[PDB]
């Protein structure tokens, strides 16, 4: 501070951020290359939001595209946070009391807490001043941070895809604000004698984000257009017959009953919802159509397919035999045996697993689908509870005609429920390849701790104890991951878990089914 101005030794040290200028140069070069190859149009701008001369936590990159609507300028922005590992933000202190002693807890600050209302206000004011329009309206298009520990010198493809997707999102939000024809299933008939088919899939390698971030995905449900006519030509050639894709994985929760109902209940968590690669448009009415595919996974109990043992290998991380540790017999059921097969696997699932699953979603305010995750989080509970529900009902009515009131009544029926659970987002490098941090679940913890029930119960309480403070739960969860997974864990963000209403899913499915949608499969 004033010490440097008081002595004034020649030479300058530090006092700068070097992960912003290089990123800006890279983005400008990529934009020039894309424009040269007739991939985009020279109608958007790229600006830098320096933290030093704006006094903000993190520097950011903003992509602004502006149009004119009835003589009123409108600006759409897609900020990209740029976290840096060379500087440390001050931590947040909290105090809890135990008996006669008080202590201080040092928490940690994520990317989500940085992007507050004041941050967006300053960003909007800066953009308005820079573009020469002081009174122009500014609309958000969804933030997307660039993860740290990423070398920008050799990641050109991911940055190019991110830039194109950002331009597409800006176009989408501008078109939505202007007002266009809503997407309806009535226009999907095609009047050519084709049908829509849904294919289920079981995977073992994690899915990847647009920036290489792994995502856990065990069950994948897709929807395709089958146009197989009589003398079909183009053998072995397919024309992009694919519309949606939903990534799901199941987790087990134990109800608190002392020891005919099964002890454990299976809960299915929805991680990612996305459209086809070929489709460059993203509208709100496609999100519900894609999400409706999640309920179809229960046609033949396909959610239990990943649980059955695979032949030849045993990672021993997702073994289902650990479920017998707390059963009537203390020991574990031994799979990987000649006698063991599907004959009594069904018996085990009937006698120890509830037949019906539970549907949950991992909402993230900083993900690719931030604009819908935030809306659903607001609809779950808060000051803006009626407006979000009304907007969701209006969108669902717009998708597929109308008359949704006959199946659902949002006035006296909650849509989404908040379970008060915060999930860390990170990646741990396995011996073979980088994996996802969410691979550690109740079954994984049970497998890691063979017979010590008390440690597992402590881990389970570290997740959803309502009495214990959330910071302590985060500390315990961060300690357990280090204890089990390894030393390569790298956190990247935060996410929240919510439970859909049981009647809402059925009402949505029945409304889509009655609206002229016919999907066939095995």
């Amino acid at each position: 501070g004033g010490i440097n101005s008081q002595f004034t030794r020649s030479g300058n040290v530090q006092g700068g951020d070097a992960r912003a200028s290089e990123a800006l140069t890279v983005f400008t070069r990529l934009k020039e290359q894309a424009v040269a190859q007739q991939d985009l149009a020279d109608d958007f701008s790229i600006l830098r939001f320096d933290r030093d001369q704006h006094q903000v936590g993190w520097s950011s990159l903003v992509i602004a595209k502006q149009i004119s609507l009835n003589g009123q300028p409108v600006i759409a922005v897609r900020p990209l946070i740029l976290p840096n590992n060379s500087i440390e933000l001050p931590k947040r202190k909290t105090n809890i009391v135990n008996g006669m002693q008080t202590d201080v807890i040092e928490s940690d600050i994520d990317v989500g807490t940085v992007f507050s209302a004041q941050y967006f206000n300053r960003l909007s004011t800066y953009v308005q001043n820079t573009l020469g329009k002081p009174g122009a309206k500014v609309v958000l298009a969804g933030p997307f941070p660039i993860p740290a520990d990423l070398v920008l010198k050799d990641s050109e493809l991911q940055l190019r895809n991110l830039l194109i997707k950002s331009v597409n999102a800006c176009d989408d939000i501008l078109a939505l604000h202007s007002g266009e024809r809503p997407f309806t299933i009535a226009g999907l008939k095609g009047q050519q004698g084709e049908t829509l088919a849904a294919k289920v899939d079981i995977r073992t390698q994690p899915l990847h984000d647009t920036v290489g971030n792994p995502i856990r995905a065990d069950i994948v449900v897709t929807t395709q257009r089958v146009r197989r006519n009589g003398q079909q030509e183009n053998e072995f050639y397919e024309t992009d017959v694919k519309l949606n894709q939903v990534a799901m994985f199941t987790n087990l929760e134990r109800t608190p009953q002392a020891q005919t109902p099964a002890p454990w209940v299976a809960s299915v968590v929805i991680t990612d919802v996305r459209n086809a690669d070929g489709i460059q448009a993203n509208t709100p009415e496609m999100y519900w159509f894609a999400l409706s595919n999640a309920f179809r996974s229960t046609h033949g109990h396909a959610w239990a397919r990943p649980f059955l043992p695979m032949t030849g290998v045993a990672k021993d991380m997702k073994d289902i035999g650990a479920l017998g540790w707390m059963s009537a017999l203390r020991n574990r059921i031994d799979t990987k045996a000649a006698n063991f097969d599907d004959a009594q696997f069904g018996q085990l699932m009937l006698s120890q697993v509830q037949p019906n699953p539970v549907f949950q979603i991992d909402l993230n305010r900083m993900g690719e689908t931030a604009q819908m995750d935030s809306l659903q989080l607001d609809a779950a509970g808060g000051p803006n509870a009626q407006k979000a529900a009304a907007t969701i009902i209006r969108q669902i009515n717009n998708l597929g005609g109308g008359g949704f009131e006959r199946f659902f009544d949002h006035t006296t029926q909650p849509i989404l429920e908040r379970t008060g659970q915060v999930i860390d987002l990170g990646n741990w490098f396995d011996g073979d390849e980088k994996r996802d941090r969410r691979d550690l679940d109740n079954l994984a913890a049970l497998n890691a701790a063979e017979g010590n029930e008390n440690e597992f119960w402590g881990f389970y309480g570290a997740q959803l104890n309502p009495n214990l403070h959330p910071d302590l739960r985060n500390r315990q969860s961060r300690n357990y991951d280090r204890q089990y997974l390894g030393s390569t864990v790298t956190y990247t963000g935060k996410a929240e878990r919510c439970t859909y209403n049981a009647k809402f899913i059925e009402a949505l499915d029945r409304y889509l089914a009655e609206a002229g949608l016919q999907i066939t499969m095995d």
């Binding site: 967006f120 935030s374 607001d378 803006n384």
Partner: peptide
Amino acid sequence: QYQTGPSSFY
């Protein structure tokens, strides 16, 4: 708690 963020819808 129930912290909120900017929304384009409203």
